[PDB]
């Protein structure tokens, strides 16, 4: 069981960091993270199935309005990411959802609030984040890529939803 997954959202929310954390077990201090290939990979056991997850990176092209059709094509699951400290990233989420739906239709999707380790400087109230999850009817995670909190859980959930 091989699965292509996309991770989308505004720039600097921590998308590349999330993929690096899940597939390599690392977190670096750089202001911007880079992946040198189309996707990183992790092989896991899910309900007696050997599953191979392939997580595709946007290559920073969201800041230049230039994400290609090839990025989205074939996707079987999706992570929508916004940042705790970035008001604009939260407001953009429903539009990112439409971009994916337009390309591949309905696929298992999770909503993610990253950088929860910086909660004292939060630009989004809990009720606001929950209100969005309810409206889009999506599983919602409070995540810290930095502290490795609720990263692995997201991809496991999505893998299980693909199989059932
Ligand atoms: N404090 C904190 N910083 C993070 C977290 N995740 C990513 N970052 C940082 O946010 C910046 C942007 O990360 P990046 O992966 O390049 O975001 P992307 O543009 O969405 O791919 C980098 O400096 C990361 O180290 C987190 O959970 N907490
Ligand atoms: Mg990136």
CSV table of N, CA and C in Angstrom, one decimal, residues 13 27 83-85 113-122 142-149:
chain,number,residue,atom,x,y,z
A,13,UNK,N,4.9,28.4,7.7
A,13,UNK,CA,4.1,27.8,8.7
A,13,UNK,C,4.8,26.5,9.3
A,27,UNK,N,15.1,18.3,13.4
A,27,UNK,CA,14.6,19.6,13.4
A,27,UNK,C,15.9,20.6,13.5
A,83,UNK,N,-0.2,28.5,11.1
A,83,UNK,CA,0.7,28.9,12.2
A,83,UNK,C,0.0,29.6,13.3
A,84,UNK,N,0.3,29.2,14.6
A,84,UNK,CA,-0.1,29.8,15.8
A,84,UNK,C,0.2,31.4,15.8
A,85,UNK,N,1.3,31.8,15.3
A,85,UNK,CA,1.8,33.1,15.4
A,85,UNK,C,1.5,34.0,14.1
A,113,UNK,N,-2.7,23.1,13.4
A,113,UNK,CA,-2.1,24.3,13.9
A,113,UNK,C,-0.7,24.0,14.5
A,114,UNK,N,0.3,24.5,13.7
A,114,UNK,CA,1.7,24.3,14.1
A,114,UNK,C,2.2,25.4,15.0
A,115,UNK,N,3.4,25.2,15.6
A,115,UNK,CA,4.1,26.2,16.4
A,115,UNK,C,3.4,26.5,17.7
A,116,UNK,N,2.7,25.5,18.3
A,116,UNK,CA,1.9,25.6,19.5
A,116,UNK,C,2.8,25.9,20.7
A,117,UNK,N,4.1,25.7,20.5
A,117,UNK,CA,5.1,26.0,21.6
A,117,UNK,C,5.3,27.5,21.8
A,118,UNK,N,4.7,28.3,20.8
A,118,UNK,CA,4.7,29.7,21.0
A,118,UNK,C,3.3,30.2,21.2
A,119,UNK,N,2.6,29.6,22.2
A,119,UNK,CA,1.2,29.8,22.5
A,119,UNK,C,0.9,31.2,23.1
A,120,UNK,N,1.9,31.8,23.8
A,120,UNK,CA,1.7,33.1,24.5
A,120,UNK,C,1.6,34.2,23.5
A,121,UNK,N,2.1,34.0,22.3
A,121,UNK,CA,2.0,35.0,21.2
A,121,UNK,C,1.0,34.6,20.1
A,122,UNK,N,0.0,33.8,20.5
A,122,UNK,CA,-1.0,33.3,19.5
A,122,UNK,C,-1.9,34.4,19.0
A,142,UNK,N,-3.4,20.1,17.3
A,142,UNK,CA,-2.5,21.2,17.8
A,142,UNK,C,-1.1,20.6,17.9
A,143,UNK,N,-0.2,21.2,17.1
A,143,UNK,CA,1.1,20.5,16.8
A,143,UNK,C,2.3,21.4,17.1
A,144,UNK,N,3.4,20.8,17.5
A,144,UNK,CA,4.7,21.4,17.5
A,144,UNK,C,5.8,20.6,16.8
A,145,UNK,N,6.1,21.0,15.6
A,145,UNK,CA,7.2,20.3,14.9
A,145,UNK,C,8.5,20.3,15.7
A,146,UNK,N,8.8,21.5,16.3
A,146,UNK,CA,9.9,21.8,17.1
A,146,UNK,C,10.1,20.7,18.2
A,147,UNK,N,9.0,20.5,19.0
A,147,UNK,CA,9.1,19.6,20.1
A,147,UNK,C,8.6,18.2,19.8
A,148,UNK,N,8.4,17.9,18.5
A,148,UNK,CA,7.8,16.6,18.0
A,148,UNK,C,6.5,16.2,18.7
A,149,UNK,N,5.5,17.1,18.6
A,149,UNK,CA,4.2,16.9,19.3
A,149,UNK,C,3.2,16.9,18.2
